[PDB]
Ligand binder design. Structure first.
Ligand SMILES: NC(=O)c1ccc[n+]([C@@H]2C[C@H](COP(=O)(O)OP(=O)(O)OC[C@H]3O[C@@H](n4cnc5c(N)ncnc54)[C@H](O)[C@@H]3O)[C@@H](O)[C@H]2O)c1
Length: 196
């Protein structure tokens, strides 16, 4: 498995002020003050609960979820340009002492496997996760959506990089970061190769 093991959370730039003000991402069930959601299940490892009790990450950028945004398949119609990739690592979460679990596919699938030890990152399909071509077979899309789940909240200061589609969005991100001079200022990188 890649070490450190990057984890990616995609979110609309309109959510960044709320993340910086709270100093964290909040799990769905912890009522984040979201401005845009990009939406179109029990967790059997401790600390248990359901998927929406965790802040979720993928193990790749340019995810199938981002393709659904790009293709207008979400209720959200603003497309990929305003969507940030927030980058951290699985090892940082462990080092910070935060409870996590991770899956080998979307956890709602009956055959989904759940893990809580970093050595079990070997159980994931890294061919699917890292694939640039994932149209067929259908299982590639499923296994590409392996997720890293952090219970209840994810501190902003674990984010190492904000990746953006364009110069204009990179500049907007820096304007927002400068409104919270106490908040960690990660590097901001234009990564067109992480988008469609
Ligand atoms: N976003 C991802 O990278 C990702 C990864 C894995 C799975 N998923 C699932 C795909 C599906 C839709 O995703 P999404 O729109 O992220 O989930 P969601 O519909 O649960 O909406 C939560 C939203 O709140 C945002 N948010 C969190 N904390 C704050 C805060 N402090 N202030 C402002 N906004 C905040 C978060 O970034 C996200 O946009 C959900 O079922 C997710 O669990 C998403």
């Amino acid at each position: 498995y890649p070490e450190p093991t990057p984890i990616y959370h995609i979110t609309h730039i309109d959510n960044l002020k709320g993340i910086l003000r709270m100093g964290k991402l909040l799990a769905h069930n912890q009522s984040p003050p979201k401005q845009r959601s990009i939406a179109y299940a029990k967790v059997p490892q401790p600390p248990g609960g359901v998927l929406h009790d965790y802040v979720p990450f993928y193990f790749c950028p340019r995810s199938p979820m981002l393709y659904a945004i790009y293709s207008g398949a979400t209720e959200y119609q603003g497309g990929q340009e305003p969507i940030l990739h927030l980058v951290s690592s699985a090892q940082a979460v462990h080092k910070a002492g935060l409870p996590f679990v991770f899956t080998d596919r979307h956890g709602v699938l009956s055959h989904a496997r759940f893990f809580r030890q970093l050595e079990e990152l070997a159980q994931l399909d890294w061919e699917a996760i890292q694939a640039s071509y994932w149209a067929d077979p259908p299982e590639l899309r499923e296994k590409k959506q392996a997720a890293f789940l952090v219970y209840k909240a994810f501190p902003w200061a674990l984010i190492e990089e904000i990746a953006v589609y364009s110069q204009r969005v990179g500049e907007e991100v820096l304007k927002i970061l400068k409104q919270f001079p106490e908040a960690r200022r990660p590097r901001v990188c234009i990564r067109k190769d992480w988008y469609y």
